[PDB]
Amino acid sequence: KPINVAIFGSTGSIGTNALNIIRECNKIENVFNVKALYVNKSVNELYEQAREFLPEYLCIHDKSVYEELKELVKNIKDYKPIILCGDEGMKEICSSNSIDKIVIGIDSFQGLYSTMYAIMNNKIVALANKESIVSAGFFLKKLLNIHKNAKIIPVDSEHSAIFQCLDNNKVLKTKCLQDNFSKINNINKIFLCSSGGPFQNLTMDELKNVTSENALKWKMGKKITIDSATMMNKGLEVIETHFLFDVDYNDIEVIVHKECIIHSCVEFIDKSVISQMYYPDMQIPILYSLTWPDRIKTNLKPLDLAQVSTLTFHKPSLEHFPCIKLAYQAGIKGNFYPTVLNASNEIANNLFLNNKIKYFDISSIISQVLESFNSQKVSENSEDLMKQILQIHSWAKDKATDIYNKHN
Amino acid sequence: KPINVAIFGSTGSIGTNALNIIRECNKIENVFNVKALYVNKSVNELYEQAREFLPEYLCIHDKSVYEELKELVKNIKDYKPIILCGDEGMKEICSSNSIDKIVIGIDSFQGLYSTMYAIMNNKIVALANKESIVSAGFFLKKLLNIHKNAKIIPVDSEHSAIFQCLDNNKVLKTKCLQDNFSKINNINKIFLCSSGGPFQNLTMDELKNVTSENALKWKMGKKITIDSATMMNKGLEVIETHFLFDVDYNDIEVIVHKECIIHSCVEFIDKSVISQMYYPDMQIPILYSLTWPDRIKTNLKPLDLAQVSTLTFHKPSLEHFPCIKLAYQAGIKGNFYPTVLNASNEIANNLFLNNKIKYFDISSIISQVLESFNSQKVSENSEDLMKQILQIHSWAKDKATDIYNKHN
Ligand SMILES: O=C(CC[C@@H](c1ccccc1)P(=O)(O)O)N(O)CCCCc1ccccc1
Ligand SMILES: O=C(CC[C@@H](c1ccccc1)P(=O)(O)O)N(O)CCCCc1ccccc1
Ligand SMILES: [Ca+2]
Ligand SMILES: [Ca+2]
Ligand SMILES: [Ca+2]
Ligand SMILES: [Mn+2]
Ligand SMILES: [Mn+2]
């Protein structure tokens, strides 16, 4: 009767917000069972969660802190969890029949690999790791066509908004990433809303001088904060929209909505538009991913629209935010160009973060790596397709660093 | 297969807008069959429509122009329609096995009356007439429980918006006007948007002396224009919301949205808000009523959110717009108080339209009638209940007139 959940990345932002909303929903009735918690290396934080939630499974990716975890957990009386580590631990959790739904709030390799294993085990995947969809969208589509009872349910706020705007009567006849999703759902176009970031109103001359300290002074992780500032975040979310909802790139419109109340909107084929709105918020997207197709009661503050008073919309300047254009171009090229976009941006974002390059150098580097890449035939074998994605991702990061080194 | 529709009141505003969107949609693909057209007395307008749509049935209410109708239709070649008159003709159309959906674009007695026969024949009724729901909501609820396959689908723009925000997998477990509709749809609260009418920036002293000319100089009929100016239209729509969707009065909030892009919003139990938006428009509400639970392609202009640029929201002042408070008071009292509100407002609206009373006298009269009414035992018998509604409607109109004459 309870929804049996695993949280991958349980000490990160998404994971901690998921546990917060689960704790609240479990106050009176047993709505969720927290079956498994996994972290990369935050052993002390994981032990504290284990004390509270007492999951059946605990897993830590970094095997150098496996013994530390086991020793900490011994102190919990009358608790004998299955304590695991590394990729093998992740696969064991994903394979458990006692787990229904998996929240993926880790990035990078562990994120893509856990997503893949969750799908291979026909789970419901509440996916918060947009970079998995960008890097490997065609591969995830292939896997979801094999593993018929698996589903990706979006958690990224804008994509949760789009999903909520749809009619569940139609959504239940398809699933995200499936060919023809937009036709079954009568989707014409998507308005993808953005905060615009901190640099949205600067002149070109001002924008040339910005630094990461300017971008880092709503509070989020450093990487995403930089991607919000360049609007590369939105570019990555355009690609994510294309894959999740089978919407053509020409039918995805970025709109800057600085109040961040409308989270995104869907235009249907009759030209009616449905939007989802709330304060900025991750509890609603996370909870909805775990309750869909139902909703359950929360104690969140109700939206006071009269207090909000004013909502504004404008189109972003592609001269000021060239990362948007690069993402459209990569997405439209398809093949492995999104993989290359993602990987090159990882390097360029970090160089800017660390004060090694200027704002317009971010897009310069990314553009040069995209122009250097040559289309490759897509492997038919799933395990070889994954190998190819990893090869291309590593090549694109090394290529970005080579461009930096040569200019330097 | 095609959507088989009858239009009641086919030369009125709703009826011509219905025929317009049917015509435009049929140019894209032929999906609607107009099976019947019924008009009050525009004998030559009905002829022109029959020429175009060639329905199986034609009906005119006024027997005086009945013969003239038949004369005109002889001139259409290879066209043998069934041509009917009056209430008898309306009942014959509603009983046709050929007709699935009936648009009610008429008012008064004939308005509630045609709605009743459509329900008794288990049809889909696209209902624009809020005064029917306000005045006779109990009779309609009872009828909808006798005739289980009948459904009312709302066309009033705000109520269509609300309905469009829902997941039809949940809607299909219930229907409009059913007890528990909001609980089954997980609805917590409604934002009922309003244009605010012409008087939001007026002071109390300015309102004291406004005239109907000030109200009548978005273009609509006189009665609803005056209701928009006093915000009694919104008050009626609050009661309509309560009946259609079973939302408690303390969970319906009126919000003034002068741009009229967001047409209304639904807050679910998780606090997520979903809204419908488009240009001001009656084509989408009418079309959705006929396509529900599907959507079809239109050639309407797409919403350009960046061009709209700014949306604003504020709370209405109850001191400036006392009709709003009277509507909530009547709705919360329940029983036949809504019937009394509607009927007394019909008289007061017309008194102001004809320069016989001032703006605050409208609410004064309505308030005095409501205070004179005493709750009635609600008949369990459907026929007796309809008689009660008619008796109370008549009483309230006469009481409003009595109050005006005693002061005058
Ligand atoms: O992609 C993102 C971050 C980047 C986007 C953003 C930024 C600020 C607000 C809204 C959107 P962007 O439009 O600038 O690319 N979300 O999905 C953020 C969600 C967090 C919402 C929240 C929770 C707590 C406190 C405050 C904001
Ligand atoms: O109740 C109504 C009329 C009263 C409300 C109103 C008035 C203007 C705009 C929006 C709403 P109110 O909020 O002032 O009470 N609708 O449902 C009107 C729908 C027609 C929309 C449209 C179509 C064509 C041209 C222009 C406006
Ligand atoms: Ca160690
Ligand atoms: Ca929905
Ligand atoms: Ca298209
Ligand atoms: Mn996002
Ligand atoms: Mn209305």
Residue numbers in the entry:
A (entry chain B), B (entry chain A): 76 to 292, 296 to 486
Excerpt from the publication:
1-Deoxy-d-xylulose 5-phosphate reductoisomerase from Plasmodium falciparum (PfDXR or PfIspC) is a homodimeric enzyme, with each subunit consisting of 488 amino acid residues. The enzyme DXR is also known as IspC, derived from the gene name ispC in the isoprenoid biosynthesis pathway. It is the enzyme responsible for the second step of a six-step catalytic reaction sequence catalyzing the conversion of the substrate 1-deoxy-d-xylulose 5-phosphate (DOXP) to 2-C-methyl-d-erythritol 4-phosphate (MEP) in the non-mevalonate pathway (MEP pathway). Accordingly, DXR, which belongs to the MEP pathway, a metabolic pathway not present in mammals, is regarded as a promising target for drug discovery. For the catalytic function of DXR, one molecule of NADPH and one divalent metal ion (either Mn2+ or Mg2+) are required per subunit as cofactors.
The most notable feature of the MAMK218 complex was the observation of two distinct conformers for the N-phenylbutyl group of MAMK218, namely a bent and a curved conformer. Additionally, Trp296 exhibited two conformers, corresponding to the two conformers observed for MAMK218. The phenyl moiety of the N-phenylbutyl group was accommodated in the subpocket in the case of the bent conformer, whereas in the case of the curved conformer, it was located in the center of the active site cleft. The side chain of Trp296 involved in the recognition of the bent conformer of MAMK218 exhibited a similar conformation to that in the MAMK89 complex. The phenyl ring was in contact with the subpocket through vdW interactions with the side chains of Ser232, Pro358, and Pro363. Additionally, the phenyl ring was engaged in a CH-π interaction (T-shape stacking) with the imidazole ring of His341. In the case of MAMK218, the phenyl moiety of the N-phenylbutyl substituent was somewhat exposed to the protein surface, attributed to the two-carbon extension of the linker length of the N-substituent relative to MAMK150. Additionally, the terminal end of the N-phenylbutyl substituent in MAMK218 displayed a degree of flexibility. The temperature factor of the phenyl moiety of the N-phenylbutyl substituent in MAMK218 was higher than that of the core part of MAMK218, and the electron density of the phenyl moiety was found to be relatively weak. The residues 293-295 and 293-297, respectively, in the flexible loops of the ternary and quaternary complexes were observed to be disordered and, therefore, not modeled.
